[PDB]
Amino acid sequence: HGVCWIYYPDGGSLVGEVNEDGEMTGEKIAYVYPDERTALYGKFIDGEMIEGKLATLMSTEEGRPHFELMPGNSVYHFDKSTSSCISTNALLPDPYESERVYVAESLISSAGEGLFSKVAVGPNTVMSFANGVRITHQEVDSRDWALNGNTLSLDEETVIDVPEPYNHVSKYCASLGHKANHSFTPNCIYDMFVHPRFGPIKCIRTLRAVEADEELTVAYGYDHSPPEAPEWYQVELKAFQATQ
């Protein structure tokens, strides 16, 4: 019997012995994060995580991953958000993200909290996940900017939001990508990400090497000439325009 690895464009993968139909179904299937080391291992059905236990990929032998289960009883399952439910376990952090980022006061003035790197990493490193409730562009675009501080476009049908009071880490910390502040000279970008718990979402990926405790920033990418944007950004866009 053979093992197969199926990679997503983001560098995450599913791995295991596939069944007769080449499906990722069994009791020893794993999702492996883009670090090629952190894994969620256990029961999957056609690649959907039913019960993934936190594990570390320790080696591969003839293509077969050898895992060690982490202590504790951290278990995860596919739990895609809906329009009204952000997560079944809002306070259960993502184990990959928790080793890479933490939330603290931004270094940007008057910008509240921000997202920071816990350790030094190279370019192109996935740091954090942007999960939220899934609502339409009509709802978002038809309402005041004060309700839209955390809205992120996912594709042409869906916007991801972290509505109050889930924007406080004491109410929701399963993902932290909504905590990244904006910069016109960012060190990170948004990228598509297929997550085994959150489903198809976006991630924050570094553009360049970043140091430990460096603040992570992304360009929010508001339309500058439809600027359809909140005030702090319109202001900031003029400073940016000046420096050029």
Binding site: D141, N148, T151, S153, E228
Partner: peptide, 8 residues
Amino acid sequence: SKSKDRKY
């Protein structure tokens, strides 16, 4: 749109 990262 009043959301981040839309592709215009």
